Design a binder for these strands. Structure first.
Length: 176
RNA sequence: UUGUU
């Protein structure tokens, strides 16, 4: 129950409650919890035609999705069930690991940055913001695998040095 | 021109 994946499901009839939904999902594995997305803006509160299903096992979720997503169609819907891991399940977010690197020497490239930031973690992707058909814009984006990696790269290398052609010491901060 | 494709 530590690797479970909450699944967003869509296009289910608005008349269906947790009962019918549970009856739908249980053939694919045991269900820990299930909740219809409700609208309480006005009376009576109504279903949003979607729900969250939380299986006990990861296997149950992956399989249920594999056999339901774009396959199954509920009475009486015009479109197949849509099913995907829920937004609340995003333990890892690139936006919280991506590091903006300003005041980079215009001469530098991808690898030149890569070697500079290698000791603090493992790079997912390394890029040089540049152009449009000009040269480098003196700055780069760098994604680290963990987040603590980036939080190390910052403390260790923010304004650690001034590079070639640059007016101010290098900046290392989380991307906006 | 400190530049966040």
């Amino acid at each position: 129950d530590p690797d479970a994946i909450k699944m967003f499901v869509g296009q289910i009839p608005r008349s269906w409650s947790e009962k019918e939904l549970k009856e739908l999902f249980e053939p694919y594995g045991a269900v820990y919890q299930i909740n219809v997305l409700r609208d309480r803006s006005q009376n009576p509160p109504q279903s949003k035609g979607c729900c969250f299903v939380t299986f006990y096992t990861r296997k149950a979720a992956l399989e249920a999705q594999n056999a339901l997503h774009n396959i199954k169609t509920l009475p009486g819907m015009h479109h197949p069930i849509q099913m995907k891991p829920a937004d609340s399940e995003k333990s890892n977010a690139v936006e919280d690991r991506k590091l903006f690197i300003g005041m980079v020497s215009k001469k530098c490239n991808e690898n030149d940055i890569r070697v500079m930031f290698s000791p603090f973690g493992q790079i997912e992707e390394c890029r040089i913001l540049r152009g449009p058909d000009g040269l480098s814009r003196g700055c780069a984006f760098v994604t680290f695998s963990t987040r603590a990696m980036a939080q190390n790269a910052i403390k260790a290398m923010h304004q650690s040095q001034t590079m070639e052609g640059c007016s101010s010491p290098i900046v290392v901060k989380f991307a906006d």
